[PDB]
RNA sequence: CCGAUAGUGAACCAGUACCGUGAGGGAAAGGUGAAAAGCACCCCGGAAGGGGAGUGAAACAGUUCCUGAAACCGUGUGCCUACAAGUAGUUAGAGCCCGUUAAUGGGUGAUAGCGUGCCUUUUGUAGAAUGAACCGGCGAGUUACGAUUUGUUGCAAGGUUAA
RNA sequence: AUACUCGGGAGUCAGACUGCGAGUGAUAAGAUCCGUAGUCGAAAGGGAAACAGCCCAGACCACCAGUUAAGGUCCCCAAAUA
RNA sequence: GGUUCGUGGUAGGAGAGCGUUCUAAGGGCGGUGAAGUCAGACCGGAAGGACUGGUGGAGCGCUUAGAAGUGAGAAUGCC
């Protein structure tokens, strides 16, 4: 009835992925793909591949109608953080979180 | 033998956090602020079980006052009248009659006037 | 200089009410049959929707 | 026809077939309870008490002898390391009123 | 338990018209506050608003005993430095009597959200003519 | 051996200080507030 | 304890100025891998009540067994060869079918061996009868020769 | 006696890594499954990563893979919220939404009353005094030998053994 | 209705204000130092707007019962436009 | 079992208890699902204790005694 794709531990900060994923939530897949194509953000290409993967799953595995699909669910979960250090003045090092994202897109008929 | 701090701590703190259900933001999530909020809620509830009794008597008295002034008595005269008459009906019952059975309240207000 | 109190979740979320993207200004082309930015050249057809190149 | 009776240091307004909660009375679940202290009788002939209406009674049958929902009474004094927690369940008798006399 | 509590729009709110002529500003105000609050009704419920609507007419003829006409000062501060303006009760009874009675009565209403709703039920007129004839106002005596 | 009952009053439970205010020996653990006698190893020699 | 834990020697950082809690050693007890404050030390738990109380205790536990009727006095008890099947059969003939302390005098090497592999059964000399051994077992099977030796002591 | 913040500093290639000119200081880090049967094949994708299919008792056991709490981050929505001045609750209380360990039930809360966190330290702290960002774990009257006193038990003008 | 005696265990040795009686001071101080009583300290509740130390009064728990204290009764705000 | 007088409380004295790990002994539960974990409107005067369902996948209660590394919200605590 619905088809899901996940991109696990993508090396992009969740906040940066979410501000884009919020555009495509509830949209028809055709419009969703257009919105991502014309949203100039680092997250857009990554979310496009998850969405097109979900559509391929819907067509190949569950034999759903691709022209009829809507983005039922889309959300970004925190992945494991890479911990780094930037040297600051006076010998002090400051933490840098190289955060990762799990990007989930679910597509459904209507 | 060694006793590690296993489970008893989590069980105790989780009960306190559940008692803080419905409280704003951190107050329903975090043990330290939930524990303060629950202590304070219990203190207010203790205080308010006493205040509740005062509050309802003020409500009843205000309603008896309103219904008595419709019979050309103040609350202070009516209650004196009922005392002299020997009528022992309490303010909660009078306030109930004054809203629900005004005819009955007027009968008592007459008994009061007679005693005065 | 420094935050006097940590910012609550509610207050943080209220501040971010306006931190969002707008949808791109796009529309379906006739010759292509796919979406394009207005006042831009459509790559699907490979030229400007109106003016042929 | 409704009456006002004195029960458990309080006054309550009863009609026939009404189910009331009062302070614990002596009585098994079958037992009939007579209230002798009737302050007022209403309904088309207001009989008024000075203070109790002589020969007036309300009869009821005991439906349940129970304990109210658990209350937790907790006191503390800030900065004095004083806390006191106490559980409370107030006993009650659930009566159904049979007849006003 | 069993104590009655009025519901919003349960108690019939009536329209009263009160002639202010020759009555002390207070005395009129204190009685009107009680009517607005619903203290004269046995259905009175502290959280609901069971009170009546009040039209005051002839507010220009409102009484000010002693030297209150010249000596009772009404202050406003803009919240700008040195932004304190003052008016005498007398000047305000001549030029803005609707304002004078509103100030007087506002002070005698509960200082809360419900108190601000009660104030909306008060209509003050300097002269003898209001335009609320549609509400079929009934004359009220103090 | 599953029904052992030591003589009534021969054994008593030891008092444990510093285990919360409910016990009456919490926080200051019976020592009161400050001074030499409140300190670890505190107290003057016998006489 | 904080003295016995590896390392700890130095003050981890200066007393004042760093904005950190003052610390004396990385093996202080509030530190993760640090010393234990009190906790177990090797000690004996052994103590003896006076001789007279210890004699009263064995007399009283043995009297209890007679009162309850758990004491079975055997004429002989011996085995030609160490045979556990024979000892098991013996216990059924006496109708034990519980835990039981067997007390024997005459060397009877075959009695110890024959009962060794049975789970509830303990065979002891008679000189070796103790309050805890009698308390650990339901029935007390004793040979006449052993009774003589127990009475000889008590 | 400990059971992975414990027990050795070290359950693991640890006096290692790392720090220091050097003497010296000195970590972190255990668990797929009974068995690799460790996912053929198809699909989207450059890959990563997914979705099927298959293995298996289980894959929400998928090569760091028993369990998987809390902080913290999200998606969805039942009730409320844009005239209000708020230590955030509590008491009263409509309305709306539910239906339980079945109880004078659960969720939410228009409006009304009352209401200055916790701890420490103080004559006195809501304090414009101290401490705590949050959650978790760890983290403080112990043992030995003496003294004394109370209780218990045995024996009693006796009682008791030490090595 | 307690005293006293003998044992075991303490904590306390920064006090505060109010009234009264004194000193010091200026017949100043929320000053200071004694005496005497009270409250706070270690005391919630009601009043004094708010307000440890003032006025009234002591919280074992529950009640949508009642009577009073100081203080109050035109409205905010319960009770007299006595 | 009644009667009478009591039951604010810091330092502090006194008492009775709850719960944690381990041992003994009795007696049990558990792949027809142990511990843990999650949820709930249940029970006790308190510390606390059950029940039911999810997750979990193999150990754990109870009774009476015994022994303690036995209870954390604060230490500019340590990780
Ligand atoms: Mg440098
Ligand atoms: Mg004790
Ligand atoms: Mg104490
Ligand atoms: Mg504390
Ligand atoms: Mg201290
Ligand atoms: Mg001191
Ligand atoms: Mg001291
Ligand atoms: Mg050292
Ligand atoms: Mg700092
Ligand atoms: Mg040191
Ligand atoms: Mg280590
Ligand atoms: Mg260690
Ligand atoms: Mg280690
Ligand atoms: Mg572990
Ligand atoms: Mg992993
Ligand atoms: Mg609004
Ligand atoms: Mg406005
Ligand atoms: Mg700080
Ligand atoms: Mg001793
Ligand atoms: Mg002074
Ligand atoms: Mg004095
Ligand atoms: Mg003090
Ligand atoms: Mg007080
Ligand atoms: Mg007040
Ligand atoms: Mg205080
Ligand atoms: Mg009263
Ligand atoms: Mg009275
Ligand atoms: Mg009034
Ligand atoms: Mg007490
Ligand atoms: Mg008392
Ligand atoms: Mg003690
Ligand atoms: Mg265990
Ligand atoms: Mg778990
Ligand atoms: Mg400990
Ligand atoms: Mg912490
Ligand atoms: Zn085109």
From Swiss-Prot, chain B:
An annotated Gene Ontology molecular function: rRNA binding
One biological process term in Gene Ontology: translation
Pfam families named in the record: Ribosomal_L20
Family matches, as Gene3D superfamilies: 6.10.160.10, Ribosomal protein L20
Gene Ontology CC: one annotated term: cytosolic large ribosomal subunit
Record has rRNA-binding as a keyword: yes
Protein keywords: Ribonucleoprotein, Ribosomal protein, RNA-binding, rRNA-binding
Annotated family: Belongs to the bacterial ribosomal protein bL20 family.
Alphabetized PANTHER family for the sequence: 39S RIBOSOMAL PROTEIN L20
Function: Binds directly to 23S ribosomal RNA and is necessary for the in vitro assembly process of the 50S ribosomal subunit. It is not involved in the protein synthesizing functions of that subunit.
Designated name of the protein: Large ribosomal subunit protein bL20
From Swiss-Prot, chain C:
Gene Ontology CC terms, in alphabetical order: cytosolic large ribosomal subunit
Family: Belongs to the bacterial ribosomal protein bL32 family.
Origin: domain of life: Bacteria
Name under which the protein is recorded: Large ribosomal subunit protein bL32B
Provenance organism: Listeria monocytogenes serovar 1/2a (strain ATCC BAA-679 / EGD-e)
Any Pfam family: Ribosomal_L32p
GO MF terms held by the record: structural constituent of ribosome
Keywords: Ribonucleoprotein, Ribosomal protein
Curated annotation (Swiss-Prot), chain D:
The entry's keywords: Ribonucleoprotein, Ribosomal protein, RNA-binding, rRNA-binding
PROSITE patterns to which the protein is assigned, alphabetical: RIBOSOMAL_L21
Pfam families xref list: Ribosomal_L21p
Cellular component terms (Gene Ontology): cytoplasm; ribonucleoprotein complex; ribosome
GO biological process: translation
Coiled coil regions, renumbered to chain: none
SUPFAM superfamilies: L21p-like (SSF141091)
GO molecular function: rRNA binding; structural constituent of ribosome
Entry function: This protein binds to 23S rRNA in the presence of protein L20.
Subunit structure of this chain's protein: Part of the 50S ribosomal subunit. Contacts protein L20.
Family: Belongs to the bacterial ribosomal protein bL21 family.
Alphabetical list of NCBIfam families matching this protein: L21
Protein name: Large ribosomal subunit protein bL21
Organism: Listeria monocytogenes serovar 1/2a (strain ATCC BAA-679 / EGD-e)
Phylogenetic placement of the source organism: Bacteria, Bacillati, Bacillota, Bacilli, Bacillales
Gene: rplU
From Swiss-Prot, chain F:
Gly residues composition-biased segments: 19-29
One GO cellular component term: cytosolic large ribosomal subunit
A GO MF term: structural constituent of ribosome
This protein's UniProt keywords: Ribonucleoprotein, Ribosomal protein, RNA-binding, rRNA-binding
Subunit (UniProt): Part of the 50S ribosomal subunit.
Family note: Belongs to the universal ribosomal protein uL15 family.
Record-given protein name: Large ribosomal subunit protein uL15
Native source organism of the sequence: Listeria monocytogenes serovar 1/2a (strain ATCC BAA-679 / EGD-e)
Gene: rplO
């Amino acid at each position: 009835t619905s088809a899901k794709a996940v991109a696990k531990t993508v090396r992009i900060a969740p906040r940066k992925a979410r501000i884009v994923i919020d555009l495509i939530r509830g949209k028809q897949v055709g419009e969703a793909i257009a919105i991502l194509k014309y949203t100039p953000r680092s997250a857009s290409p990554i979310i496009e591949k998850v969405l097109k993967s979900a559509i391929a799953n819907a067509e190949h595995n569950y034999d759903l109608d691709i022209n009829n699909l809507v983005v039922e669910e889309a959300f970004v979960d925190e992945g494991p953080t890479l911990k780094r250090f930037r040297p600051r003045a006076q010998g002090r090092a400051s933490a840098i979180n190289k955060r990762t994202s799990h990007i989930t897109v679910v597509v459904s008929e209507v | 033998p060694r006793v590690k701090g296993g489970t008893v701590t989590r069980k105790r703190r989780k009960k306190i956090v559940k008692l803080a259900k419905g409280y704003y933001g951190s107050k329903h999530l975090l043990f330290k602020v939930a524990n303060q909020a629950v202590m304070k809620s219990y203190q207010y509830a203790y205080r308010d079980r006493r205040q509740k009794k005062r509050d309802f008597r003020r409500l009843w008295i205000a309603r008896i006052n309103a219904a008595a002034r419709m019979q050309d008595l103040s609350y202070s005269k009516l209650m004196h009248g009922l005392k002299l008459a020997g009528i022992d009906i309490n303010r909660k019952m009078l306030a109930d009659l004054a809203v629900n059975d005004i005819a009955s309240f007027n009968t008592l207000a007459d008994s009061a006037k007679k005693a005065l | 200089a420094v935050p006097f109190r940590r910012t609550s979740k509610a207050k943080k979320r209220k501040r971010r009410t306006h931190v969002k993207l707008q949808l791109p200004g796009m529309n379906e082309c006739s010759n292509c049959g796919e979406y394009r930015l207005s006042h831009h050249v459509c790559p699907e057809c490979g030229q400007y929707d109106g003016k042929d190149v | 026809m409704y009456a006002i009776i004195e029960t458990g240091g309080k006054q309550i307004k009863v009609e026939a077939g009404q189910e009331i909660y009062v302070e614990k009375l002596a009585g098994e679940v079958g037992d009939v309870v007579t209230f002798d202290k009737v302050l007022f009788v209403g309904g088309d002939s207001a009989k008024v008490g000075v203070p109790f209406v002589e020969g007036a009674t309300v009869t009821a049958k005991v439906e349940k002898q129970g304990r109210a929902k658990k209350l937790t009474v907790y006191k503390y004094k800030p900065k004095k390391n004083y806390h006191k927690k106490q559980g409370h369940r107030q006993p009650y008798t659930k009566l159904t009123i049979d007849a006003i006399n | 338990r069993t104590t009655y509590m009025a519901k919003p729009g349960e108690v019939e709110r009536k329209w009263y018209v009160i002639d202010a002529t020759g009555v002390s500003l207070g005395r009129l105000s204190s009685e009107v506050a009680s009517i607005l609050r619903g203290k004269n009704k046995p259905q009175f419920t502290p959280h609901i608003d069971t009170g009546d609507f009040v039209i005051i007419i002839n507010a220009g003829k409102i009484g000010l005993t002693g030297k209150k006409a010249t000596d009772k000062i009404y202050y406003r501060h803009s919240q700008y430095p040195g932004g304190l303006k003052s008016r005498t009760a007398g000047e305000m009874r001549t030029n803005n009597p609707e304002k004078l009675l509103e100030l007087s009565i506002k002070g005698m209403l509960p200082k809360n959200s419900l108190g601000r709703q009660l104030f909306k039920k008060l209509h003050v007129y300097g002269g003898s003519e209001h335009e609320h004839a549609a509400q079929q106002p009934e004359v009220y005596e103090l | 051996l599953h029904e052992l009952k030591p003589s009534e009053g021969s054994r008593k439970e030891r008092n444990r200080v510093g285990r919360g205010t409910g016990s009456g020996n919490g926080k200051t653990s019976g020592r009161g507030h400050k001074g030499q006698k409140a300190r670890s190893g505190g107290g003057v020699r016998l006489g | 304890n904080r003295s016995e834990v590896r390392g700890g020697g130095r003050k981890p950082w200066r007393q004042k100025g760093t904005g950190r809690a003052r610390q004396g050693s990385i093996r202080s007890p509030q530190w993760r891998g640090g010393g234990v404050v009190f906790g177990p030390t090797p000690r004996s738990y052994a103590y003896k009540l006076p001789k007279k109380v210890r004699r009263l205790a064995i007399k009283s536990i043995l009297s209890s067994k007679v009162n309850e009727e758990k004491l079975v006095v055997l004429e002989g008890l011996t085995f030609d060869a160490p045979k556990t099947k024979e000892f098991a059969a013996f216990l059924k003939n006496i109708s034990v079918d519980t835990k039981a302390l067997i007390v024997v005098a005459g060397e009877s090497e075959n009695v110890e061996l024959s009962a060794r592999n049975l789970q509830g059964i303990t065979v002891i000399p008679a000189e070796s009868i103790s309050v805890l051994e009698v308390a650990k077992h339901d029935k007390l099977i004793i040979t006449k020769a052993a009774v003589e030796k127990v009475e000889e002591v008590l």
